[PDB]
């Protein structure tokens, strides 16, 4: 064939820390269907937001928003335990169906996105050029968010481990840990990946007693 229908830009959702995660790559022939399992960002999370995006940027904010919906009623559990199946299905007419289903509860929510939605030809070409001109920066952003999410998860895990230990943790140890948790919390608000990792290292250096 010399011609066929494609979806012109990548399609996906916003994940923890403002990153776009792709479900359907740009230029995929349509009709197409792809599913991916996601989970919760923190412990005891009973609801997730499914924000549908079109574009090639790593920051969710830089892509075209196609719509959003919430999935509620997830049983509060440790982070990473829920299995949230997200499906993107584009039919032959270019109509996009997005669904999210929590495997444990059976709870499901969906949205239908019209084929006329998203970016036009000129905006598509600008999107592609802007992504290539910002490839290094977008990569650094993505690496920064992965570190931030690890740091955020370390902050929560340490805090829970401290309370679970309680009296067994010596005074001098507990104070050094609380001070390093504050230094990590501050570093997480910045955009320097190595500064966050160094604060995670300093926290680990004062946390041997909890281990």
């Amino acid at each position: 064939v010399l011609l066929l229908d494609v979806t012109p830009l990548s399609l996906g959702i916003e994940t923890m820390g403002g990153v776009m995660t792709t479900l359907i790559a740009k230029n995929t022939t349509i009709p197409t269907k792809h599913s991916q399992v996601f989970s919760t960002a923190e412990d005891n999370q009973s609801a997730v937001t499914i924000h549908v995006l079109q574009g090639e940027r790593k920051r969710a904010a830089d892509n075209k928003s196609l719509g959003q919906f919430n999935l509620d009623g997830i049983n509060p559990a440790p982070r990473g335990m829920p299995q949230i199946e997200v499906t993107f299905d584009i039919d032959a007419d270019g109509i996009l169906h997005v669904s999210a289903k929590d495997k444990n509860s059976g709870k499901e929510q969906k949205i239908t996105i019209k084929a006329s939605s998203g970016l036009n030809e000129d905006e598509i070409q600008k999107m592609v050029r802007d992504a290539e001109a910002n490839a290094e920066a977008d990569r650094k952003f993505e690496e920064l968010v992965q570190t931030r999410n690890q740091g955020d998860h370390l902050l929560h895990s340490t805090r829970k481990q401290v309370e679970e230990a309680g009296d067994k943790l010596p005074a001098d140890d507990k104070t050094a840990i609380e001070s390093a948790l504050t230094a990590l919390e501050t570093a997480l608000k910045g955009e320097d990946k190595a500064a966050i990792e160094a604060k995670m290292q300093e926290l680990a250096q004062v946390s041997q007693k909890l281990m």
Binding site: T15, M16, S39
Partner: peptide
């Protein structure tokens, strides 16, 4: 699995 934001 990748994490999702909460409402």
């Amino acid at each position: 699995p990748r994490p999702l934001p909460f409402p």
